[PDB]
Coordinates of C-alpha atoms and ligand atoms in Angstrom, one line a residue:
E1 CA 11.8 15.7 -33.0
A2 CA 11.3 19.9 -32.7
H3 CA 8.7 19.5 -29.9
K4 CA 7.0 21.6 -27.3
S5 CA 9.1 22.0 -24.1
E6 CA 8.1 19.0 -21.8
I7 CA 8.7 20.8 -18.7
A8 CA 6.5 23.9 -19.9
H9 CA 3.8 21.7 -20.8
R10 CA 3.7 20.3 -17.6
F11 CA 4.1 23.2 -15.7
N12 CA 1.1 24.9 -17.6
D13 CA -1.0 21.6 -17.3
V14 CA -1.0 21.3 -13.3
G15 CA -0.4 24.8 -12.3
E16 CA 2.4 26.0 -10.3
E17 CA 1.3 24.7 -6.7
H18 CA 0.8 21.1 -7.7
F19 CA 4.1 21.3 -10.1
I20 CA 6.4 22.4 -7.0
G21 CA 4.7 19.7 -4.6
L22 CA 5.0 17.1 -7.5
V23 CA 8.9 17.9 -8.1
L24 CA 9.5 17.8 -4.1
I25 CA 8.0 14.7 -4.1
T26 CA 10.2 13.3 -7.3
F27 CA 13.4 14.2 -5.4
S28 CA 12.5 12.9 -2.1
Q29 CA 11.7 9.5 -3.7
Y30 CA 15.1 9.6 -5.6
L31 CA 17.1 10.5 -2.8
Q32 CA 15.6 9.5 0.7
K33 CA 18.6 10.4 2.7
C34 CA 19.3 13.9 1.7
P35 CA 18.1 16.5 4.4
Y36 CA 15.1 18.8 3.3
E37 CA 17.1 21.9 2.4
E38 CA 19.0 20.2 -0.4
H39 CA 15.7 19.0 -1.6
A40 CA 14.1 22.5 -1.5
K41 CA 17.1 24.1 -3.3
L42 CA 16.7 21.5 -6.1
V43 CA 13.0 22.4 -6.4
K44 CA 13.7 25.9 -6.6
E45 CA 16.1 25.5 -9.3
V46 CA 13.6 23.3 -11.5
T47 CA 10.7 25.5 -11.0
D48 CA 12.8 28.7 -11.9
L49 CA 13.9 26.5 -15.1
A50 CA 10.3 25.5 -15.8
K51 CA 9.0 29.3 -15.5
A52 CA 12.0 30.5 -17.8
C53 CA 10.6 27.9 -20.6
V54 CA 7.1 28.6 -20.1
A55 CA 8.4 32.3 -21.0
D56 CA 10.6 31.5 -24.2
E57 CA 10.4 27.7 -25.3
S58 CA 13.5 27.9 -27.1
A59 CA 15.5 28.9 -23.7
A60 CA 18.5 26.4 -22.2
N61 CA 17.3 23.0 -21.1
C62 CA 13.9 23.4 -22.2
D63 CA 13.9 20.8 -24.8
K64 CA 15.1 18.3 -22.3
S65 CA 13.3 15.2 -21.1
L66 CA 12.2 15.3 -17.5
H67 CA 14.5 12.6 -16.8
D68 CA 17.3 14.7 -17.9
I69 CA 16.5 17.7 -15.8
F70 CA 16.1 15.9 -12.6
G71 CA 19.2 13.9 -13.4
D72 CA 21.5 16.7 -14.4
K73 CA 20.4 18.7 -11.2
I74 CA 20.8 15.4 -9.1
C75 CA 24.3 15.3 -10.6
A76 CA 25.3 18.8 -9.8
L77 CA 24.8 18.3 -6.2
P78 CA 28.5 19.0 -4.6
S79 CA 27.4 17.1 -1.5
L80 CA 26.2 14.0 -3.4
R81 CA 28.7 11.1 -2.8
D82 CA 28.6 11.4 1.1
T83 CA 24.9 10.4 1.6
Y84 CA 25.4 7.1 -0.5
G85 CA 27.8 6.5 -3.1
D86 CA 25.5 4.1 -4.4
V87 CA 23.8 7.1 -6.3
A88 CA 27.3 8.7 -7.0
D89 CA 27.9 5.7 -9.7
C90 CA 24.4 6.5 -11.2
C91 CA 25.5 10.0 -12.3
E92 CA 28.1 8.5 -14.7
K93 CA 25.5 6.8 -16.5
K94 CA 23.7 8.3 -19.5
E95 CA 19.9 8.4 -20.1
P96 CA 18.1 6.1 -19.8
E97 CA 20.5 3.8 -17.8
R98 CA 20.7 6.8 -15.3
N99 CA 17.3 7.1 -14.6
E100 CA 16.9 3.2 -14.1
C101 CA 19.8 3.6 -11.6
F102 CA 18.1 6.0 -9.5
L103 CA 14.7 4.1 -9.5
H104 CA 16.8 0.8 -8.5
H105 CA 18.0 2.5 -5.0
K106 CA 14.2 3.2 -3.9
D107 CA 14.3 1.9 -0.2
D108 CA 11.1 0.4 1.0
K109 CA 12.3 0.8 4.7
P110 CA 15.4 3.3 4.8
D111 CA 17.4 3.8 7.9
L112 CA 15.7 6.8 9.5
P113 CA 14.9 7.9 12.7
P114 CA 10.9 7.4 13.2
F115 CA 8.8 10.2 12.4
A116 CA 8.5 12.5 15.4
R117 CA 5.4 14.6 15.8
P118 CA 6.2 17.8 17.8
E119 CA 4.1 19.0 20.6
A120 CA 0.8 20.6 19.7
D121 CA 2.3 24.4 20.5
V122 CA 5.5 23.5 18.8
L123 CA 3.6 22.0 15.6
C124 CA 1.2 25.0 15.6
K125 CA 3.7 27.6 15.8
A126 CA 5.8 26.3 12.9
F127 CA 2.6 26.2 10.9
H128 CA 1.9 29.9 11.5
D129 CA 5.3 30.9 11.2
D130 CA 5.8 29.6 7.4
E131 CA 3.2 27.6 5.8
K132 CA 4.9 26.7 2.7
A133 CA 8.1 25.3 4.5
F134 CA 5.9 23.5 6.9
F135 CA 4.1 21.5 4.1
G136 CA 7.1 21.2 2.3
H137 CA 8.4 19.2 5.3
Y138 CA 5.2 17.0 5.2
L139 CA 5.4 16.2 1.6
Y140 CA 9.4 15.5 2.0
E141 CA 8.8 13.2 5.2
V142 CA 6.2 11.4 4.0
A143 CA 7.6 10.7 0.5
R144 CA 10.9 9.8 1.5
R145 CA 9.8 6.8 4.0
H146 CA 7.3 6.0 1.2
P147 CA 8.9 6.3 -2.0
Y148 CA 6.3 4.5 -4.0
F149 CA 3.7 7.0 -2.4
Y150 CA 0.8 8.0 -5.0
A151 CA 2.1 11.4 -5.8
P152 CA -1.2 13.1 -6.4
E153 CA -2.9 11.3 -3.3
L154 CA -0.1 12.5 -1.3
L155 CA -0.7 16.2 -2.5
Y156 CA -4.4 15.5 -1.2
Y157 CA -3.2 14.3 2.2
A158 CA -1.2 17.4 2.6
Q159 CA -4.3 19.6 1.9
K160 CA -6.2 17.5 4.9
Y161 CA -3.1 18.0 7.3
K162 CA -3.6 21.9 6.6
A163 CA -7.3 21.7 7.1
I164 CA -6.9 19.9 10.7
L165 CA -4.0 22.6 11.5
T166 CA -6.4 25.6 10.5
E167 CA -8.8 24.1 12.5
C168 CA -7.1 23.0 15.7
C169 CA -4.2 25.5 16.2
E170 CA -6.7 28.5 17.0
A171 CA -9.3 26.3 19.3
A172 CA -8.5 26.6 23.1
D173 CA -7.1 23.1 23.9
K174 CA -4.6 22.2 21.1
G175 CA -3.3 18.8 21.7
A176 CA -6.7 17.3 22.4
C177 CA -8.0 18.6 19.3
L178 CA -5.3 17.6 17.0
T179 CA -3.9 14.1 18.5
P180 CA -6.9 12.1 17.4
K181 CA -7.2 14.0 13.9
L182 CA -3.6 13.5 12.9
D183 CA -3.6 9.8 14.2
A184 CA -6.9 9.4 12.1
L185 CA -5.0 10.9 9.2
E186 CA -1.8 8.9 9.5
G187 CA -3.9 5.9 9.7
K188 CA -5.5 6.7 6.1
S189 CA -2.2 7.6 4.7
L190 CA -0.4 4.4 5.6
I191 CA -3.4 2.5 4.1
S192 CA -3.1 4.8 0.9
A193 CA 0.8 3.7 0.8
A194 CA 0.4 0.2 1.2
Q195 CA -2.3 -0.2 -1.6
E196 CA -0.2 1.9 -4.1
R197 CA 2.8 0.0 -3.1
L198 CA 1.0 -3.2 -4.1
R199 CA 0.0 -1.7 -7.4
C200 CA 3.7 -0.8 -8.3
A201 CA 4.7 -4.6 -7.3
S202 CA 2.0 -5.9 -9.5
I203 CA 3.0 -3.6 -12.3
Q204 CA 6.6 -3.8 -12.0
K205 CA 7.0 -7.7 -10.9
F206 CA 4.1 -9.5 -12.6
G207 CA 3.5 -7.3 -15.6
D208 CA 0.9 -4.6 -16.9
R209 CA -1.6 -7.6 -17.1
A210 CA -1.8 -8.4 -13.4
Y211 CA -2.7 -4.9 -12.4
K212 CA -5.2 -4.6 -15.5
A213 CA -7.2 -7.6 -14.4
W214 CA -7.0 -6.3 -10.8
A215 CA -8.4 -2.9 -11.9
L216 CA -11.1 -4.5 -14.0
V217 CA -12.5 -6.5 -11.5
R218 CA -12.5 -3.8 -8.9
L219 CA -13.9 -1.2 -11.2
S220 CA -16.8 -3.6 -12.2
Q221 CA -17.8 -4.0 -8.7
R222 CA -17.8 -0.3 -8.1
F223 CA -19.7 0.8 -11.4
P224 CA -21.5 -2.4 -12.4
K225 CA -23.9 -0.6 -14.5
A226 CA -21.2 0.7 -16.8
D227 CA -20.6 -1.6 -19.7
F228 CA -17.4 -3.3 -20.8
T229 CA -16.0 -0.9 -23.2
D230 CA -16.0 1.8 -20.9
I231 CA -14.8 -0.2 -17.8
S232 CA -11.8 -1.4 -20.1
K233 CA -11.2 2.0 -21.2
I234 CA -10.8 3.3 -17.6
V235 CA -8.5 0.3 -16.8
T236 CA -6.3 1.2 -19.6
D237 CA -5.9 4.8 -18.5
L238 CA -5.5 4.1 -14.8
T239 CA -2.7 1.4 -15.9
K240 CA -0.9 4.3 -17.7
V241 CA -1.5 6.4 -14.7
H242 CA 0.1 4.1 -12.2
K243 CA 2.8 2.8 -14.3
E244 CA 4.2 6.5 -14.7
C245 CA 3.6 7.2 -10.9
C246 CA 5.3 3.9 -9.6
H247 CA 8.1 4.8 -12.1
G248 CA 8.7 8.2 -10.8
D249 CA 7.2 10.2 -13.7
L250 CA 5.1 12.0 -11.2
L251 CA 4.2 15.0 -13.2
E252 CA 2.8 13.1 -15.9
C253 CA 1.0 10.8 -13.5
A254 CA -0.9 13.9 -12.0
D255 CA -1.8 15.0 -15.3
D256 CA -3.0 11.9 -16.8
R257 CA -5.0 11.4 -13.7
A258 CA -6.7 14.9 -13.8
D259 CA -7.5 14.0 -17.6
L260 CA -9.1 10.4 -16.3
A261 CA -11.0 12.3 -13.7
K262 CA -12.5 14.9 -16.2
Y263 CA -13.2 12.1 -18.7
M264 CA -15.4 10.0 -15.9
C265 CA -17.1 13.2 -15.0
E266 CA -18.0 13.9 -18.5
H267 CA -19.5 10.4 -18.7
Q268 CA -20.9 10.2 -15.5
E269 CA -24.3 9.3 -17.0
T270 CA -23.2 6.2 -18.5
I271 CA -20.8 4.9 -15.6
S272 CA -22.3 5.7 -12.0
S273 CA -24.8 8.3 -10.4
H274 CA -22.7 8.1 -7.6
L275 CA -20.2 10.2 -9.6
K276 CA -22.5 13.3 -9.1
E277 CA -21.1 13.9 -6.0
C278 CA -17.6 13.9 -7.0
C279 CA -17.8 15.7 -10.2
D280 CA -18.2 19.2 -9.0
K281 CA -15.3 19.3 -6.6
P282 CA -11.6 20.5 -7.1
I283 CA -9.3 18.3 -8.9
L284 CA -7.6 16.7 -5.9
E285 CA -11.0 16.1 -3.7
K286 CA -12.4 15.2 -7.1
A287 CA -9.9 12.3 -7.9
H288 CA -9.8 11.2 -4.2
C289 CA -13.7 10.8 -4.2
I290 CA -13.6 8.7 -7.3
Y291 CA -10.7 6.7 -6.2
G292 CA -12.6 5.5 -3.0
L293 CA -16.2 5.9 -4.5
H294 CA -18.6 3.5 -2.7
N295 CA -19.7 0.7 -5.1
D296 CA -22.9 1.4 -7.1
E297 CA -26.1 -0.6 -6.7
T298 CA -26.3 -3.8 -8.7
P299 CA -28.3 -3.1 -12.0
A300 CA -31.7 -4.8 -12.5
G301 CA -32.3 -7.5 -15.2
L302 CA -28.8 -9.1 -15.5
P303 CA -29.4 -12.3 -17.0
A304 CA -27.8 -15.7 -15.1
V305 CA -24.1 -15.3 -15.8
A306 CA -24.0 -19.2 -16.7
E307 CA -25.9 -18.2 -20.2
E308 CA -22.8 -16.7 -21.5
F309 CA -20.2 -18.7 -19.9
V310 CA -21.4 -22.5 -19.3
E311 CA -24.6 -22.6 -21.8
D312 CA -23.7 -20.8 -24.6
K313 CA -22.4 -23.1 -27.6
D314 CA -19.3 -20.6 -28.6
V315 CA -17.8 -21.0 -25.3
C316 CA -14.8 -23.1 -26.2
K317 CA -14.7 -20.8 -29.4
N318 CA -14.8 -17.6 -27.6
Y319 CA -12.3 -18.9 -25.2
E320 CA -9.8 -20.4 -28.0
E321 CA -10.3 -17.5 -30.7
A322 CA -10.2 -14.4 -28.5
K323 CA -9.0 -15.4 -24.8
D324 CA -8.2 -12.3 -23.2
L325 CA -11.3 -10.5 -24.5
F326 CA -13.4 -13.5 -23.5
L327 CA -11.7 -14.0 -20.0
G328 CA -11.9 -10.2 -19.3
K329 CA -15.7 -10.2 -20.1
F330 CA -15.9 -13.1 -17.3
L331 CA -14.4 -11.0 -14.9
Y332 CA -16.3 -8.2 -15.5
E333 CA -19.9 -10.1 -15.6
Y334 CA -19.0 -12.1 -12.7
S335 CA -17.4 -9.3 -10.6
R336 CA -20.6 -6.8 -11.2
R337 CA -22.8 -9.6 -9.8
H338 CA -20.4 -9.9 -6.9
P339 CA -19.5 -6.7 -4.7
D340 CA -19.4 -9.2 -1.8
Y341 CA -16.5 -11.0 -2.8
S342 CA -12.9 -9.8 -2.6
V343 CA -11.0 -8.8 -5.5
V344 CA -8.4 -11.6 -5.1
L345 CA -11.4 -14.2 -4.6
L346 CA -13.1 -13.3 -7.8
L347 CA -9.5 -13.2 -9.8
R348 CA -8.9 -16.8 -8.6
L349 CA -12.6 -17.6 -9.6
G350 CA -11.3 -16.3 -13.1
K351 CA -8.2 -18.5 -13.2
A352 CA -10.1 -21.7 -12.1
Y353 CA -12.6 -21.0 -14.7
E354 CA -9.8 -20.4 -17.3
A355 CA -7.9 -23.6 -16.1
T356 CA -11.5 -25.4 -16.3
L357 CA -11.8 -24.6 -20.1
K358 CA -8.1 -25.2 -21.2
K359 CA -8.7 -28.9 -19.7
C360 CA -12.4 -29.2 -21.1
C361 CA -12.1 -27.7 -24.6
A362 CA -9.3 -30.1 -25.2
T363 CA -11.7 -33.2 -25.0
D364 CA -14.3 -34.5 -27.3
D365 CA -17.4 -33.3 -25.2
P366 CA -16.3 -30.2 -23.3
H367 CA -19.7 -28.9 -22.0
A368 CA -20.2 -32.2 -20.5
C369 CA -16.6 -31.5 -18.9
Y370 CA -17.2 -27.9 -17.7
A371 CA -21.1 -27.8 -17.1
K372 CA -20.2 -27.6 -13.5
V373 CA -17.7 -24.9 -13.5
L374 CA -19.6 -22.3 -11.7
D375 CA -21.0 -24.7 -9.0
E376 CA -17.3 -25.6 -8.4
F377 CA -16.3 -22.4 -7.1
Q378 CA -18.0 -23.1 -4.1
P379 CA -15.0 -24.3 -2.1
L380 CA -12.9 -21.5 -3.3
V381 CA -15.6 -19.1 -1.8
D382 CA -16.0 -20.9 1.3
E383 CA -12.3 -20.9 2.4
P384 CA -12.0 -17.2 2.5
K385 CA -15.4 -17.1 4.4
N386 CA -14.4 -19.5 7.1
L387 CA -11.2 -17.5 7.5
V388 CA -12.8 -14.2 8.0
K389 CA -15.5 -15.7 10.1
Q390 CA -12.8 -17.6 12.5
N391 CA -10.4 -14.7 12.8
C392 CA -13.0 -12.1 13.5
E393 CA -14.5 -14.3 16.5
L394 CA -11.0 -14.5 17.8
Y395 CA -10.5 -10.8 17.4
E396 CA -14.2 -10.0 19.1
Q397 CA -12.8 -12.1 21.9
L398 CA -9.1 -11.0 22.3
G399 CA -9.2 -7.2 21.4
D400 CA -6.6 -5.4 19.8
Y401 CA -3.5 -6.0 21.6
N402 CA -3.8 -9.8 22.2
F403 CA -5.1 -10.4 18.8
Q404 CA -1.8 -8.8 17.6
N405 CA 0.0 -10.9 20.2
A406 CA -1.5 -14.2 18.7
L407 CA -0.8 -13.0 15.3
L408 CA 2.9 -12.3 16.2
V409 CA 3.2 -15.8 17.8
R410 CA 1.5 -17.3 14.7
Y411 CA 3.5 -15.6 12.3
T412 CA 6.7 -16.0 13.9
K413 CA 6.2 -19.7 14.0
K414 CA 5.3 -20.0 10.1
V415 CA 8.6 -17.7 9.1
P416 CA 10.9 -17.7 11.9
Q417 CA 13.9 -16.6 9.9
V418 CA 12.3 -13.6 9.1
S419 CA 13.8 -10.4 10.8
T420 CA 12.2 -9.3 14.1
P421 CA 11.2 -5.7 13.3
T422 CA 9.5 -6.9 9.9
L423 CA 7.5 -9.5 11.9
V424 CA 6.3 -7.0 14.8
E425 CA 5.4 -4.6 11.9
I426 CA 3.3 -7.0 9.8
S427 CA 1.7 -8.9 12.7
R428 CA 0.5 -5.6 14.2
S429 CA -0.7 -4.4 10.5
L430 CA -2.7 -7.7 10.3
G431 CA -4.0 -7.0 13.8
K432 CA -5.4 -3.9 12.3
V433 CA -7.1 -5.6 9.6
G434 CA -9.7 -6.8 12.2
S435 CA -10.2 -3.5 13.8
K436 CA -10.9 -1.9 10.5
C437 CA -13.2 -5.0 9.0
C438 CA -14.8 -7.2 11.8
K439 CA -17.6 -5.2 12.7
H440 CA -18.4 -4.4 8.9
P441 CA -21.8 -6.0 7.5
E442 CA -21.3 -9.4 5.7
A443 CA -21.8 -8.0 2.3
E444 CA -18.6 -6.0 2.6
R445 CA -16.8 -7.9 5.1
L446 CA -15.0 -10.3 2.7
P447 CA -13.8 -7.5 0.7
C448 CA -12.5 -5.6 3.4
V449 CA -10.6 -8.3 4.9
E450 CA -8.9 -10.0 2.1
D451 CA -7.9 -6.9 0.0
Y452 CA -6.5 -5.4 3.1
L453 CA -4.5 -8.6 3.6
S454 CA -3.2 -8.6 0.2
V455 CA -1.4 -5.1 0.8
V456 CA -0.4 -6.0 4.3
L457 CA 1.2 -9.3 2.7
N458 CA 2.8 -7.4 -0.2
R459 CA 4.6 -4.9 2.2
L460 CA 6.0 -8.2 3.9
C461 CA 7.0 -9.6 0.5
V462 CA 8.6 -6.1 -0.2
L463 CA 10.5 -5.9 3.2
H464 CA 11.9 -9.7 2.6
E465 CA 12.8 -9.0 -0.9
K466 CA 15.2 -6.2 0.6
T467 CA 16.5 -8.8 3.3
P468 CA 16.0 -12.3 1.8
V469 CA 16.1 -15.1 4.7
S470 CA 12.9 -17.5 4.2
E471 CA 12.7 -19.7 1.2
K472 CA 8.8 -20.0 2.2
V473 CA 8.2 -16.1 2.1
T474 CA 9.8 -16.1 -1.2
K475 CA 7.8 -19.0 -2.4
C476 CA 4.3 -17.0 -1.5
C477 CA 5.8 -14.0 -2.7
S478 CA 6.9 -14.6 -6.3
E479 CA 4.6 -17.7 -7.4
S480 CA 1.4 -16.1 -7.8
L481 CA 0.2 -12.6 -7.0
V482 CA -3.7 -13.8 -6.3
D483 CA -2.9 -16.7 -4.4
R484 CA -0.7 -15.0 -1.8
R485 CA -3.1 -15.0 0.9
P486 CA -4.2 -18.7 0.8
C487 CA -0.4 -19.6 0.4
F488 CA 0.5 -17.7 3.5
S489 CA -2.6 -19.2 5.7
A490 CA -1.8 -22.8 4.5
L491 CA 1.7 -22.3 6.0
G492 CA 2.1 -24.5 9.4
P493 CA 4.7 -23.8 12.2
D494 CA 8.0 -24.5 10.6
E495 CA 9.5 -27.4 12.4
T496 CA 12.8 -27.3 10.8
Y497 CA 14.0 -24.0 12.2
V498 CA 16.6 -24.3 14.7
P499 CA 15.8 -22.3 17.8
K500 CA 18.3 -19.2 18.4
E501 CA 20.0 -18.9 21.5
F502 CA 18.6 -15.9 23.9
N503 CA 20.6 -12.8 23.6
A504 CA 21.7 -11.4 27.2
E505 CA 21.5 -7.9 25.8
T506 CA 17.8 -8.1 25.0
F507 CA 16.1 -7.3 28.0
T508 CA 18.9 -4.9 28.8
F509 CA 16.9 -1.5 29.2
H510 CA 18.5 1.9 30.1
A511 CA 15.2 3.5 31.2
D512 CA 15.4 5.6 27.9
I513 CA 12.1 3.4 27.6
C514 CA 10.5 5.2 30.5
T515 CA 10.3 8.3 28.2
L516 CA 8.2 6.2 25.8
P517 CA 4.4 6.4 25.6
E518 CA 2.5 3.1 26.2
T519 CA 1.9 2.6 22.5
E520 CA 5.7 2.3 21.9
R521 CA 6.0 0.2 25.1
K522 CA 3.6 -2.2 23.6
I523 CA 6.0 -2.4 20.7
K524 CA 8.9 -3.2 22.9
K525 CA 6.8 -6.0 24.5
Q526 CA 5.8 -7.3 21.3
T527 CA 9.6 -7.2 19.8
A528 CA 10.5 -9.3 23.2
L529 CA 7.5 -11.5 22.5
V530 CA 9.1 -12.4 18.9
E531 CA 12.4 -13.1 20.1
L532 CA 11.1 -15.5 22.9
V533 CA 9.2 -17.4 20.4
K534 CA 12.4 -17.5 18.1
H535 CA 14.2 -19.0 21.1
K536 CA 11.4 -21.4 22.1
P537 CA 9.1 -21.8 19.2
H538 CA 6.7 -24.7 21.1
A539 CA 6.5 -22.2 24.1
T540 CA 3.0 -21.8 25.3
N541 CA 0.7 -18.8 25.7
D542 CA 0.8 -18.9 29.4
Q543 CA 4.7 -19.1 29.3
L544 CA 4.7 -16.0 26.8
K545 CA 2.1 -14.5 29.1
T546 CA 4.0 -14.9 32.4
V547 CA 7.5 -13.6 30.9
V548 CA 5.6 -10.7 29.3
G549 CA 3.6 -10.4 32.1
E550 CA 6.9 -10.0 34.2
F551 CA 8.3 -7.4 31.7
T552 CA 5.1 -5.2 31.9
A553 CA 5.5 -5.7 35.9
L554 CA 9.2 -4.5 35.4
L555 CA 8.0 -1.4 33.5
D556 CA 5.2 -0.8 35.7
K557 CA 7.7 -1.1 38.5
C558 CA 10.6 1.0 37.4
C559 CA 9.5 3.9 35.4
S560 CA 7.2 5.2 38.0
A561 CA 10.3 4.3 40.6
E562 CA 12.5 7.4 41.4
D563 CA 16.0 6.4 39.8
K564 CA 14.7 4.2 37.4
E565 CA 18.4 2.7 36.6
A566 CA 19.0 1.1 40.1
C567 CA 15.3 -0.4 39.6
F568 CA 16.1 -1.7 36.1
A569 CA 20.0 -2.5 36.9
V570 CA 18.6 -4.9 39.6
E571 CA 15.3 -5.9 37.7
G572 CA 16.5 -6.5 34.3
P573 CA 19.0 -9.4 35.1
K574 CA 16.6 -11.0 37.2
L575 CA 14.2 -11.1 34.0
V576 CA 16.6 -13.0 32.0
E577 CA 17.1 -15.6 34.5
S578 CA 13.2 -15.7 35.3
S579 CA 12.5 -16.4 31.6
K580 CA 14.8 -19.1 31.5
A581 CA 12.9 -20.8 34.3
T582 CA 9.5 -20.5 32.8
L583 CA 10.7 -21.2 29.1
Ligands
CL601 CL1 -7.3 7.4 -9.0

């Protein structure tokens, strides 16, 4: 087992700048609470060590696994036990249990202050004083709040963040240039985080096979002229990439992803002409381009899908003798014909087809039994379409704020045991599905909506698993990955839930609220709306509206009032009595 130093290999493969970023991210994701300055020191020591091994491969520590290098540096942190003590224990284990112990402490919602944005002048000045430390902080802040963030994409966002600052910090008015572009970039980055968290849940909680079937369908939609063997190749390498990334093997992840990008670029002629635009760019823009590439057009001359999958004499034979191959070919062939379906719908159709063959190939005239199996998809196709049609109409009608309020009331009634901040967060994110998708054309609307519901509901499943209270969430989350959305949509109001009393100290506000922007005021209003519903589950909209209306007017009234405490002191008690009279 004489071998090439792994740390040298990786540093040589990704280059010093990406190496440093990737090591910072690894530490930030393993030790989410530790201050930036500790992480920086650790990054410095690992980088120095990588650079010594690059120079002499037989140097101290050069023959160790990456896991061992990281773990040894973490365990030589003098101020280790004070931040967790959970982790302190980890350091008495040997590899591999030690690495596994660090990964089990990744926290999906760490108890941290919310990410502050400084004022434009402040932000700009920090950028100009020290670029490297400034972008350090950004990787760290994002990585510690999103411990499964796709590491190479985080590097790419840090580039985009750098370009927005380079743009705006010279321009005349700074804030007005910055705020919309940084809000725009945060939005995209929270979507990236949610997509990747679902890749990791699928891999880690449901197996390599759940992720592979998902990637097959999505890549067949995106590169429908490519052939099955090529798609499957790409699925296999991407699975290895996300497995490593989701597991904190981030250097390996970035290196394997670059190789994948190079492979698709070299084979672009047999994959998609739309690759031309990506394949001349530098690696982070190159990979990000591939990652989100617009679907190719559907190729001409594809025979009716029913010839292979219903009419061929060998349908039962191919299903029985080569099941995964045959069903993978189904998913490919059906998906490449349907870029207008969502991935989860296509996976559901695949499961129905498989259940039909299981049943029918076990009878004495199977073709008799399964002849209509493609026509019988229609009910599974219409349900998602009606969901989209009816909720987009509801969105158009109510607008963003009241669409969020509708979903908050609806979700609090389905799963009222769920903690308030999870409810508020999840419902606001479902609201944001409307805004993103509802003005899209039909061709792309079902995919947009249902696969974005997928990532939002996974966030619910992940937050809930950390703090488990609702049996119904546990059931929808653990039973089926591809059935989650219909399972959640089918839940009615929970009529066995016992209403909680109203906490006196729920409308008690110290006028620290008056320093909040309007966007965070809405969140306080929506938090209060959830607690109203948890107290009177059958409360009407007009009732909820008059109480939140009366909280709106309290805020409108006191925050412009010189001496907001004397106001809030005298207006807040009268709100918790006026609420009882309405409810
Ligand atoms: Cl990718």
